[PDB]
Amino acid sequence: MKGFAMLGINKLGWIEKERPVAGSYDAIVRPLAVSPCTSDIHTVFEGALGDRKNMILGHEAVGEVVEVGSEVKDFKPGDRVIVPCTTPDWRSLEVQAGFQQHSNGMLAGWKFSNFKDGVFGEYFHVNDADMNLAILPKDMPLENAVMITDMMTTGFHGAELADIEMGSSVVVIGIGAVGLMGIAGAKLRGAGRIIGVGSRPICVEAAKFYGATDILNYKNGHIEDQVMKLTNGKGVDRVIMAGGGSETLSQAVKMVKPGGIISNINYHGSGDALLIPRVEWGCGMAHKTIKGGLCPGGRLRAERLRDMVVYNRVDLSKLVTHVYHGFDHIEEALLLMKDKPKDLIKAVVIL
Amino acid sequence: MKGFAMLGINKLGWIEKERPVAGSYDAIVRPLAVSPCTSDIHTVFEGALGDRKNMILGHEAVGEVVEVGSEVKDFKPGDRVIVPCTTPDWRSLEVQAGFQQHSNGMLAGWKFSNFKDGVFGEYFHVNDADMNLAILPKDMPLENAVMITDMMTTGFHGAELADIEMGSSVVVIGIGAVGLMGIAGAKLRGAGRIIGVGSRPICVEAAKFYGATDILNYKNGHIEDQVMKLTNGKGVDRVIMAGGGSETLSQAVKMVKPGGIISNINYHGSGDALLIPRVEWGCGMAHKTIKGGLCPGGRLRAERLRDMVVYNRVDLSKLVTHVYHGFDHIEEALLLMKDKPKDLIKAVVIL
Amino acid sequence: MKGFAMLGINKLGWIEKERPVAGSYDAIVRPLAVSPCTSDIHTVFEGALGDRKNMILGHEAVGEVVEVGSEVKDFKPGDRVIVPCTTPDWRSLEVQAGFQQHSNGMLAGWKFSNFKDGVFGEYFHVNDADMNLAILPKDMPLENAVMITDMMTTGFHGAELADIEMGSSVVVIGIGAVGLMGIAGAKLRGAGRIIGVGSRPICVEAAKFYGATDILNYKNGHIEDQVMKLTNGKGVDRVIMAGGGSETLSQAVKMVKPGGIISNINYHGSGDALLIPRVEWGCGMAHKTIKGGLCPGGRLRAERLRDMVVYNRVDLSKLVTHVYHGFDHIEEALLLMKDKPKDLIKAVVIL
Amino acid sequence: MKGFAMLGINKLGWIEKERPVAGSYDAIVRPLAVSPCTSDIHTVFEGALGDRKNMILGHEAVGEVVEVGSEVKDFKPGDRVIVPCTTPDWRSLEVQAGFQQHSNGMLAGWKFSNFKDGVFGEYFHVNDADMNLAILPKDMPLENAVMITDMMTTGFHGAELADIEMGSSVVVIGIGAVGLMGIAGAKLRGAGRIIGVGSRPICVEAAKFYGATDILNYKNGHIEDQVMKLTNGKGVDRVIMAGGGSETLSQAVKMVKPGGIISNINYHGSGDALLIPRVEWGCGMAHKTIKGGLCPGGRLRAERLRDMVVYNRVDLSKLVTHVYHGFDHIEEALLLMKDKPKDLIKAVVIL
Ligand SMILES: [Zn+2]
Ligand SMILES: [Zn+2]
Ligand SMILES: [Zn+2]
Ligand SMILES: [Zn+2]
């Protein structure tokens, strides 16, 4: 089969690969719709996850089941399914410890395009079908459903890790697709004021659409200062880091209140470390908690998020600015996440 | 001064009481708008809190500060304020333990109409003005603001105690004002499916408006059985008990999943005890957690909820079905909470 | 293969059954040491598990693996293992939802002598060996190791569910083996005062050994009243229900502080329900949380507790008062759990 | 009155100030025994707090109440009390928010020798006596009681923040008094393996006494590498930062498992910032939570820890290696926390 893979760090292209075979508990799926992620640009042109060779990219897709193992009971050929980007090995001590995202290793719950051939191929492999797939509702637009697989689960996890309280004030740094879902998630956790930080006009409008009450541009003065001004020097209760460089950690620390929580869902693919300003972190005694985690995956998570969409808790259509028809457009679509044009949030390639 | 008080069990009427005086940290406030509560009914016509004599009723009001103690720094005469029904004594070991609602005693955080003269008087006393009051926004309708003091904080507390997860399935038993805010709060905590239980026409519509995806009526078969069918034998993740008799606990236990949480915010006014069905509670080993708590109060809570209304996170106007002008209407309004006409949800008396 | 089973109601006796075969991920184990449980006595002499046709009893044992399925990778014949009484199916949505104990059904994580032959047989079946077994340390006395499989995990789970704080006052109702581990677990969560409730001398001394600072005899006065006397009418922070009748719930609600937590680890098998005293439960608004759950099982749980024993965090030898050397002494021991002498806590048969 | 104070940054000496006067809710206390803390050495010869003008030092004391305001109800002249180093303003929004330690400002809950005159004076002021004092048991040794005020509450808070689970593996970096309490606290939260890092012989022996199962000398090599060796490359579940410089944060991240928690109670008064290693922090998605907070204070905390000592949950006598007798020794004592000989842990000057 054919697949669009990374031909080593800093290089990519279409390659020929043997079609994967399903294990007793797995399923082979052919994509019906896929989307490129900024994370795949970190992995390729930054090698933030180490080197790789001939690894088919992509981890955001909805498709049709073509083959299932002899032990698969809840899925069969013909089923259209939503595939979370995180497909953990449920039989691991990490799962028993409460962290499905790290089953058998740090980040190992996320396989597709991490270390396992991705969804940008005529067919792809899903480990443990019954535990990692969810049925795609018949009336659900493909482009919308693809947003559940990574953007929605990641942005919401940002809101979940933030442990938001009814009326909490929240700052979401970065209003790209992940940041927009962080805003939506924060609103769906009861947040009062929500301050989104970004400049790309299209993202600014979506930010407000999802719940932002204030929008700040990281080019009108240090974001910390702006936030303090807006909050009368009181700061905010929570900060979700969803975009920008590692310096955003310091900014988050300076703008969050003592006792607050900073939740990172931004995949930092460059630099040796992230700095915590000593003074503003109360010399390590300000109870300014810092969290950061990979998005949850698996069937339960996908079914729960899917159902929220079906119940109109969030409108994912606003995330998709670019829709293409035809496998060949995957190359160009991915390159958009690298060049990032002004009118782009997320792109979906419908096969 | 005059006030509408409980002349004793089953007796209501206007009486004279000395005008309250503020201590160093207190404030004397005159009501601008008030609302009667079903709780006032449990206390009077059922002595749910024990015998009382000439206690002014009511605990839901927005008003104007007339006098403040010498140590009050953040409030002054003339200030328009939102008064949370729960006004805790912040200097207590219970607060130090994390439960403001029980400062100096079980339910002692709630004073108005519990054991302290209520807001149905020409003037009422608010302990610790700086810690228990919030400014009423200049553009906020008085009837809407009154809904923050009890209905919103209570219903939302139901959702908070329910520890809702993104996409959780939730059943709210009872769709009166409190149940409606429970539905709104559940959606604002990320709930997917929300099943409201009620039949009153106006309440049914408000419930769907606040987030209910399904509506069930008792007069159509045992509620627990109906829910089991709807969830195809699986049950729901969470249950918020907002209204009805004590037998609703058994209903909640039967419809909730193992590991689920039952959140009670219903003020049970009669009966010796509440029953838990042994079998369905997994003989006490099914991790079906049961919570039950008094709504939070105090300045922080009121300001956070106030701000949620300002940022249109919830529309409180749908709760007020009846509006009266004139202090004297308090009697008629309070009686409606007793009669419960099918077109009533909440009534507000604007002085 | 022979094994002491429940012939029928009030009927016990050895029987002949075919040796269970292992599935690809299972392991067959032969007992090295086992222990009768109060739950064994109730399933038979009380039909607390309906009617079972020739079901081999027992669910507390440590042993030697004799066979493993083709897909088992961490265990092999000859391995000595600790077998947690709860061996759930790790591939289920309940597990993805955070409740291993109820995987594929309420209390379904508990299989041995529930709907699967128990450990009182020459050989027994363990589902998913890699996820549900833990190696038995070389120099760990067998009697102590068996106490891990249920007494330790259950008692400690009572302390875990109680969400004990440093210096918290705790009451453990019932000082049988489970209550003793509840006492030890509470001390291991930092409890200050620990009040044990029971009457048998052997248990009273053991309770003090594990951490009890006060002892109350339930036969000499209403327990809630005695607790109020010990606490100057203030009540306690937490209550762990580990014994006695279901009225113990009412007693627990009456002695616990508002905002407190009641943790049930006792199997309630009589009557149609448990009662919550309305008044003392603050009419359902006292924030007196009620929890109850089957002990966690699985490999991680077993290795973690095992290591606590290895690092001498708890001395389990005090739980074993009767040690038999012989495979046939199983019937004697089980009946020894029925007639329950005053000098018995737990009996261990080292075959 | 006299006393030892911080006559500016880097300059010490006894100054003459007007004996403090108690307000309506305050109390004046005469020290019976006090102890110097490394924390003051910082504020002084490091200016980690900024600049201070004539601030009496010391915040670890047990004393006699000699004067109370007209509103104090639970304490009176003659009472012997335990004074927590942290004495919050319970009437603040931060308290309403759940953070007593930062009432009215970051770290503002901590007054003595922060911005308020300390206890190294003939008499000191205690804000809100009823809310911030605890009775000293008559049998409890003075030197032991002093250890409660800061060392115990801080070390235990380190264990609390770490959210330790039964059987968790824990590493405590630094074994000075605070770290020793962190070890004792970790053990009292159910920890299995506890690895202590330090070299002072007296501290190492105290580490083992309080629960340490392994001891590591950071001078031997990168502690993260030593820890990985000890745990066969698996890392540990939790880390408590109680000593060393800001680089210990990186070491903590490198030795803790994904999903683990890092708890800082170490007061970092030097350097621009602490670094988080990008790769080992899973690029910010490894769920390696980082917390850090000032110790809790107030009456409830003091009474709970006091009771733990009374019930022998922890033996504080091991922390006191130096005992003097004379208010004039205070000066000498504090100097020990500066040079710090290898046979000293904490010093107590009895008056
Ligand atoms: Zn992605
Ligand atoms: Zn009310
Ligand atoms: Zn058992
Ligand atoms: Zn200190």
Coordinates of C-alpha atoms in Angstrom, one line a residue, chain A residues 94 105 169 279 328:
Chain A
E94 CA 0.2 2.2 34.0
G105 CA 6.1 4.0 28.7
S169 CA -11.1 33.2 35.8
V279 CA 10.2 35.1 42.7
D328 CA -3.1 13.3 -2.8

